[PDB]
């Protein structure tokens, strides 16, 4: 059959409502999958919006699933369980730690006509699931 | 990839010890046909986990990197999944980032293992080609025979692993050792990590204390842990995570109190002796609080002064075990005199404040309110093993441990943390000379050099001088061989040997991959790693396990012990053909079909009637171990030495050594030793006088060793495209460098290159560079200096740093954020 | 398993095959990773119905034709690279080489994992990364020092001059401007020949450019000759899409509609090749034995063959006397100089007199309706790398001109080609013929750049080359590693001093490290088509634009832009030192994209105020732009362009010489003498000493030096080592069979191969795969070259010695017949 | 789920196959022609008591023309653009224009019943988005 999962399209907010380096919590692609979006204030890789600086991630650590905390100052996600850290400015690259996958990126559509930010897929496999869509 | 193929309920499952570090975490390998898959319901997959809804935290370690699809020699394809064993006592289901990549590092034709050696490779006619096994053996045996006949064994050189786990282990160290020492009988042998045939732990072993003398459980029972010249979160990850941190968190307090009902147990505390502040220090402070952690940020190379000051102090305070000293030791009074150093003088030499020295001693050695001495476990690794005079530092440290009775009591020990796993069974080394092999090769000695499971181009001390000489000598052979036309094996053996009389050197590498050695080698032979073969090894508490075969090796790759047998038999056949019965007999005893045959011949023959002299970590009860018995023991194995075996009890072993005070010496007593403080060795001091930066070096948590697998891993290469050097930010500002610039690092010994990595906690005029890497080899700047047993001071070198430029792609793609957690 | 279909609205771009001359047209579909097309035909971009089995011939689609690429911004995209059904070149065919394109695009995890993506420096006896700026400072620094002290004669190059991937009009212009106009060095060879010369001097001098027809001509011919050519393997889809339809009778109605008063017999085909090939086997399968002649000549006897045929046709009067009279010079002289009886021709070539007469009757005797047969004469490396390139072409063209087989439809005397073409360069800046490999071997030069070639694998006399270059490189390595803390200036000085003591600094500009990494000091990362826009033309002069659709790996760059970077680095250095005259030589490389190089070179040829430019596009090249090519699609335009306007688009030229105006002083085709001299002495000496003819060349599956193929698991399983086709009776005598390893050797060198018994190979003859990564054939080729320094690569003899049985080859490699029946 | 659901299709029993006499069957549906043969000497993915029974999709992986089985050379031959595939080397392309080896039909051999059953395919059959339509 088909090779792709059927991802929902989940509205997050509109881009101008996000303040620089003030993260937004949301669930995607279901209520058991916590995620963060942040407007980082300076352009980065996968960044969307008018300043190519809005990114989002799954916050479940890809080692053993402990929820990571977002450090607004260093623009990093930090896992309290075995001390892995992931760089929000480098598409989830593991800075140091015990995981074998980068932090999954939530793919965001930015729609200039409406200003809307919509989550539309995930790059990488979220912790604790056989596929991103259960 | 947004999905994983689950193991079916009925998938094949085998046991595998991690290929990599000392800890020897236990794993399971699930193997099943490619087109099958497990169900999400927990009783329909082999994991027993419920994938119909999100799994909770800590339920699983499972990523796509922990899966693969292998193709067997018969063409059948199988899913594999390599995941940690929750019920193994070592790791309790933890997996480091290194062992978690195992499934990715299994051979497949399209994945990270694509470039595995799978055929003999010959450099002839100025090109690499395939050759047959038979031809490779005829050339290699041919040259060894010619050399033995004309020059003797002194012409035949090796640098070989002596470790456990992948590229080592009881079968492989026995096969290689029997070949080098019993059959060829050459003394011209170094070890993978040191340039002579020596021990890392001569002083401790001579004083009567083997370096793996406790259990990992002891770290859970300690009041205090010392980590000396060690970065355990990065280098012994799951020992630190599964045993040390639970103690610091208070999770083992009830166990201590139940074992010792009349003894106080304060909150556990941890002391690091390391010039550099590391991720391990950062994490300890996060977990336990600053007030439970002491970082003795010693001046480089001042360990002996530190321990002599501590020993002096504890003796003056009477924080020693006088009855233990009287009953179970020799040499105390002499050591008190020879090692006398005041706290003020200790403080001046080490840079550590007197108050921190006194606090370290009070936490560690002052009797508790209930009367008993603290249980202080002293753990050490390469910051002192490759430190300023290996022998002397261990002498100084052990003196402090013996006087304070911190061996033989539960929650204590004075132990190596270990590097690789261990798995040594060999004949005795066949001479009594200390021979610095790299120096001999550089001076032009030897006809043939084999690198076996090691890559000294990346890992020797003074590595540039080694490379330069080996390239030069190898090229002489290349030039001569390429003039041949139509040469038979015999003719080409002659051409090669004559080139070695004119400065040349024939170079063989026996390896998983070409490596940088391919730039010099003339012959490369394909080896097999655990899972393509059965293998035994032990971890840092002497826990021996069997790693089970589950797939075929690539092409014609072979277990190292069987490569050794192939060589031995080729030489035996040649001698027999030429009517040399005495020489043929030296090569008997390699009639091996399987790696279990090498286990039987070596480990299981130690100390047995009619056996030759065997030096085995299994000792004389090793015969009690068989593969079937190990299999029954599972990933918990048995701690050596084995005490007993029967069907009903299985293998029964030994938790802690020296619990009755019987030490490994002539009189059964531990022997104190003098520990002179001599300053930095002159060869090192000369570089420090001329150049600005201490060139500390060592491990990164993510990178394994010479990156022989990592160099093919896209995530690894994206993160660390070049070796990095940690530098103090004010030093960076002065040199106008920042994260992702390339610098040259240099001194009299060599030059290398690294990407700058500013790190706040690095001290001014100190740096730290990743060792051993595939892009910027650190060892170029290490000196030739070695201690009395030819142990290098790899951590002892100074150099200058010069900006090359800004590497834009590193700045765009590589994180230079803090690897130290807060 | 399964394929992710392109969504109906997937992005689609045009791509010419990267590889062979034929230049098949392809589409690249690109779409986001997590999206997929529907199975219904209007819901995927292919327009095909995947709800039920597709019929045969409906599609070319395998997993190897798909990938997932990761762009510099981290966004991941599906790609699918599939042949264009509406392209006239291939009509939707894909060879096994072009079919792998998607697999050979860069990905961090796939076959392109080891692409160069950063400058690499060998310093301190190790490979490290370095910065672009540092690489340029070292390389420009050494070039400046050399120019200042030694002059241009110190600066050596071996550079592509071809089209397609690792060539094309942008890239040949940028490199040519750098080498010839800026550096002004004569010390330049070409990727496939060791001097700056033409493969086709004689034909060009006689007035006939070597790409003088259309692929449609092969469809209109009565007879096709394939001379020194294995076209099913080496020009696959020309053979499949144009030649075989003719042989099958599918084009008969077209011929009869074009020429209502002319008979068209069944089409016939004639191969001139010492070796029986897959191409002969398939021609016999399709057309029957009686329509195919294999003239299985003795090696190196082409000139004798053509002189015998020419002599015979003149004696029979099977020539075009009015054409000769009106449009040629030198006929009577050539009749005298090239006289050879059929008996003498037979004795030399080994071909029976009756087969010689049959070939001439099929090809040149007038048809019943009065007209001469339309005979297309196609030739490639079996004569271009044959016994005296210049003389064989002289002999062949004589026969073609006398029989008027250029300028009529269904005719031509044409190269089949190798790579695509895409040449636009300044004139070569001297008048000396310089054998570059020999000069390097003798110790000349301070700096050598290999640019889009790998002569370690492909030079003639390759072992002597490698030996010298390794030696001289090591001198530089030894000197560099003694440096500590050297600034760029200091290191340039260290290197220069080593080159005064026998050393050579070696740079490689490439997609991959290659074997050259064993000698190189500096390697620079290049980009291939699709990572960059690129133009080039096929073997009927059909120019197309290959469109960018992805980013290159890391900091890899289009070769024309590497050239600009070097030129600008040199300009800046000269400007800093107040050397205005030298700085001015490096002007004219203000280029930001490859279209800037197309504008500066191809589009300026012959224009007012332009310098001397030698371009395959000629003076009407300015009519071509990328936007106009895009509009033309994968059909492009055949050069020369005649006209452009919006309503008609680009309009070009089908066939050359249709009015008998040749490219000579007087507009006439010029006959030339073709002396028969036997084998050259250097070659004859090896043949006298050694037993086997060491023929060599292409395999259908392997592309060139296997620079991508070496990383392809299917390729490495099939061909783990170079193979040598050997006669079965010879194999029995040597006690070898399929999958044994032999050494092949002569005075020039030694190499190794896996034995491949083939029934059709003649006793005492062999055929070894050229250029490979495991057993380099060229080691046994001699140093002999013709008057213009064209090597006789096909002319070498050697002995064969059994090494032993390679068990794994026997278990895993097929040694079954690659010749179809 | 990551895997297709392949049918289990009975071919015949092993003792009914004669050495080098191919059997035609469809798998995994009637539009997918396949051949099974007992080769008479062990090979690769060979099943049965002599590890010599193999099966393949016969649609050429280039453009889908049905291949013919040459019993003598143990090869599959495509008449359209002349590709050949080796039945004794798991479908390896000997020469030709394809970019995938000939798909292997996976056979279960059941000693208890003597049955040969087709249970999956290794490789993607010509002309389909997935082996199971
Ligand atoms: N992630 C990872 N783990 C590994 C390895 C690997 O490659 N990767 N390799 C394994 C191997 S083979 C080994 S041997 C071990 C090494 O394990 P460790 O020895 O723990 O690691 P290193 O980084 O070599 O050095 C440890 C510390 O020595 C300190 N040091 C330097 N000079 C001195 C000195 O003069 N005195 C003192 N007291 N300390 C000093 C350094 O600052 C460093 O933090 O790790 C093993 N585990
Ligand atoms: N599959 C594939 N196709 C390719 C290439 C590739 O690497 N792979 N490379 C491309 C390139 S760059 C080129 S230049 C072309 C080459 O295309 P071709 O020239 O067609 O191929 P070759 O195999 O080099 O040689 C052609 C024939 O010359 C014959 N030959 C040898 N000696 C003589 C002789 O003395 N006289 C005559 N008459 N014939 C003789 C050989 O038997 C061989 O069959 O192929 C291109 N196409
Ligand atoms: S997973 Fe492996 S690398 Fe060490 S920490 Fe455990 S043995
Ligand atoms: S696909 Fe490519 S290799 Fe030639 S035959 Fe067509 S241009
Ligand atoms: S669960 Fe995050 S580091 Fe282990
Ligand atoms: S369809 Fe089979 S070879 Fe093309
Ligand atoms: Mo070590
Ligand atoms: Mo060519």
Tell me about this structure.
- Chain D: This is Arsenite oxidase subunit AioB.
- Chain D: It comes from Alcaligenes faecalis.
- Chain D: Heterodimer consisting of a large and a small subunit.
- Chain D: Residues 20-116 form the Rieske domain.
- The complex is a heterotetramer, with 2 copies of chain A, 1 copy of chain B (822 residues) and 1 copy of chain C (821 residues).
- By secondary structure, chain A is mostly beta strands.
- Chain A has strands at 10-14, 24-27, 34-39, 54-58, 69-71, 76-78, 85-87, 93-96, 105-111, 116-123.
- Chain A is globular.
- Chain B has 822 residues and is of the alpha/beta class.
- Helices cover 31% and strands 18% of the residues of chain B.
- Chain B is built from 28 helices and 31 strands.
- In chain B, the strands form 8 sheets. A 7-stranded mixed sheet of chain B has the order 6-5-18-17-16-7-8. A 6-stranded mixed barrel of chain B has the order 26-30-27-29-28-31.
- The chains are: A mainly beta (134), B alpha/beta (822), C alpha/beta (821).
- Chains B and C meet through strand 6, helix 2, helix 19, helix 26 and strand 28 of B and strand 6, helix 2, helix 19, helix 26 and strand 28 of C.
Tags for this model:
heterotetramer, B: 822 residues, alpha/beta, 4 domains, 7-stranded mixed β-sheet, 6-stranded mixed β-barrel, 31 strands, 31% helix, C: 821 residues, Immunoglobulin-like, Rossmann fold, Dimethylsulfoxide Reductase, domain 2, binds ligand MGD, binds FE2/S2 (inorganic) cluster, binds molybdenum(IV) ion, oxidoreductase, arsenite oxidase, molybdenum cofactor, MGD
Distance N to C terminus of chain C: 32 Å
Radius of gyration of chain A: 14 Å
How many domain units of chain A? 1
**Proportion in helices of chain C:** 25-40%
Number of domains of chain C: 4
> Ligands in the structure?
ligand MGD, FE3-S4 cluster, FE2/S2 (inorganic) cluster, molybdenum(IV) ion
Biggest sheet features of chain C = 7 strands, mixed
- Looking at CATH, which topology of the largest domain in chain C would you report? Dimethylsulfoxide Reductase, domain 2
Strand content of chain A: 35-45%
Domain Rieske (chain A): 21-117
Disulfide bonds (chain A): 66-81
Catalytic activity (chain A): 2 oxidized [azurin] + arsenite + H2O = 2 reduced [azurin] + arsenate + 3 H(+)
EC number (chain A): 1.20.9.1
């Amino acid at each position: 059959l088909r090779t792709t999962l059927q991802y929902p399209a989940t509205q997050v907010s509109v881009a101008k409502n996000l303040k620089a380096n003030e993260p937004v919590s949301f669930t995607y692609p279901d209520t058991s999958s916590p995620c963060v979006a942040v407007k980082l204030g300076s352009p980065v890789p996968g960044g969307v919006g008018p300043n190519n600086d809005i990114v989002a991630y799954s916050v479940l650590c890809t080692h053993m699933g402990c929820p990571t905390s977002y450090d607004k100052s260093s623009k990093t996600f930090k896992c309290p369980c075995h001390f892995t850290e992931f760089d929000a400015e480098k598409a989830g690259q593991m800075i140091c730690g015990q995981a074998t996958e980068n932090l999954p990126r939530v793919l965001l559509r930015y729609d200039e006509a409406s200003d809307a930010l919509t989550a539309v897929g995930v790059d990488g496999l979220i912790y604790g699931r056989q596929a991103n869509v259960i | 990839n947004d999905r994983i193929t689950l193991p079916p309920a009925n998938a094949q499952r085998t046991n595998m010890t991690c290929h990599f570090c000392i800890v020897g975490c236990g794993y399971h390998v699930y193997k099943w046909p490619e087109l099958q898959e497990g169900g999400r319901a927990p009783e329909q997959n082999a994991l027993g986990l419920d994938f119909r809804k999100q799994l909770p935290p800590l339920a699983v370690t499972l990523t796509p990197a922990m899966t693969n699809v292998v193709t067997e020699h018969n063409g059948r394809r199988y899913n594999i999944m390599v995941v940690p064993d929750k019920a193994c006592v070592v790791n309790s289901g933890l997996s480091s980032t290194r062992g978690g990549k195992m499934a990715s590092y299994m051979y497949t034709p399209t994945g990270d293992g694509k470039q595995r050696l799978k055929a003999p490779r010959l450099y002839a006619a100025d090109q690499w080609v395939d050759t047959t096994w038979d031809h490779a053996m005829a050339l290699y045996a041919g040259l060894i025979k010619k050399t033995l006949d004309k020059d003797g064994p002194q012409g035949v050189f090796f640098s070989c692993f002596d470790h456990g786990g992948a590229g080592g282990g009881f079968e492989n160290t026995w096969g290689t050792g029997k070949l080098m020492f019993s059959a060829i009988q050459t003394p011209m042998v170094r070890i993978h990590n040191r340039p002579a045939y020596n021990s890392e732990c001569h002083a401790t072993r001579e004083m009567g204390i083997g370096e793996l003398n406790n259990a990992y459980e002891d770290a859970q029972l300690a009041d205090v842990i010392w980590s000396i010249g060690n970065n355990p979160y990065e280098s012994q990850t799951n020992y630190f995570l599964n045993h040390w941190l639970p103690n610091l968190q208070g999770a083992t307090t009830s166990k201590k109190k139940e074992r010792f009902p009349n003894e106080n147990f304060p909150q556990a505390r941890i002391i690091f002796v390391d010039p550099r502040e590391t991720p391990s220090v950062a994490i300890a402070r996060h977990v336990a609080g600053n007030d439970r952690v002491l970082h003795l940020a010693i001046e480089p190379g001042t360990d002996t002064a530190l321990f002599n000051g501590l020993f002096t102090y504890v003796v003056e305070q009477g924080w020693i075990d006088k009855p233990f000293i009287e009953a179970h030791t020799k040499g105390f009074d002499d050591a008190v005199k020879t090692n006398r150093l005041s706290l003020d003088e200790c403080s001046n030499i080490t840079g550590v404040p007197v108050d921190m020295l006194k606090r370290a001693a009070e936490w560690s050695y002052k009797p508790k309110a209930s009367g008993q001495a603290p249980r202080t476990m002293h753990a050490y690794e390469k910051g002192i093993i490759w430190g300023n005079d290996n022998y002397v530092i261990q002498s100084a440290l052990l003196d402090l441990v013996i006087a304070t009775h911190n061996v033989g009591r539960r929650g204590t020990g004075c132990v190596r943390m270990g590097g690789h796993q261990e798995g040594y069974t060999r004949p005795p080394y066949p001479g009594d000379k200390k021979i610095y092999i790299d120096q001999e090769l550089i001076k032009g000695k030897g006809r043939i050099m084999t690198w076996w499971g090691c890559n000294n181009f990346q890992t020797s001390n003074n590595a540039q001088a080694l490379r330069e000489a080996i390239l030069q000598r190898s090229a002489i052979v290349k030039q001569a061989m390429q003039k041949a036309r139509g040469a038979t094996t015999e003719e080409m053996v002659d051409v090669i040997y004559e080139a070695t009389q004119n400065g040349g050197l024939f170079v063989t590498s026996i390896n998983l991959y070409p490596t940088k050695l391919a730039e010099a080698a003339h012959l490369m032979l394909p080896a097999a790693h655990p899972g393509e073969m059965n293998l035994t090894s032990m971890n840092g508490e002497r826990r021996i396990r069997l790693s089970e075969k589950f797939m075929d090796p690539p092409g014609t790759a072979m277990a190292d012990c069987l490569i050794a047998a192939r060589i031995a038999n080729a030489l035996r056949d040649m001698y027999q053909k030429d009517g040399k019965a005495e020489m043929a007999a030296q090569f008997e005893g390699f009639d091996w079909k399987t790696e279990e045959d090498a286990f039987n011949d070596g480990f299981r023959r130690a100390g047995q009637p009619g056996a030759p002299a065997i030096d085995s970590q299994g000792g004389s009860t090793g015969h009690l171990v068989t593969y079937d018995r190990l299999r029954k023991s599972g990933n918990n194995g048995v701690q050596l030495p084995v005490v007993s075996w029967d069907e009903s009890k299985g293998l029964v072993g030994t938790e802690m050594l020296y619990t009755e005070g019987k030490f490994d010496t002539d009189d059964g007593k531990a022997h104190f030793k003098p520990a002179p403080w001599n300053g930095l060795p002159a060869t090192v001091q000369q570089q420090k006088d001329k150049y600005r930066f201490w060139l500390n070096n060592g491990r990164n948590n993510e990178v394994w060793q010479t990156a022989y697998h990592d160099q093919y891993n896209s995530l690894m290469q994206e993160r660390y495209p070049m070796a990095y050097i940690e530098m103090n930010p004010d030093d960076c500002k002065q040199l106008d460098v920042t994260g992702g610039d390339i610098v040259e690092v240099y001194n009299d010994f060599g030059s290398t290159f690294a990407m700058v990595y500013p790190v706040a906690e690095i001290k001014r005029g100190q740096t730290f560079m990743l060792f051993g890497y595939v892009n910027g080899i650190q060892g170029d700047v290490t000196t030739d200096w070695t201690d009395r047993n030819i142990i290098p001071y790899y951590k002892g070198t100074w150099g200058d740093i010069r900006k090359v430029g800004s590497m834009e792609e590193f700045k765009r793609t590589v994180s230079f954020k803090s690897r130290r957690f807060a």
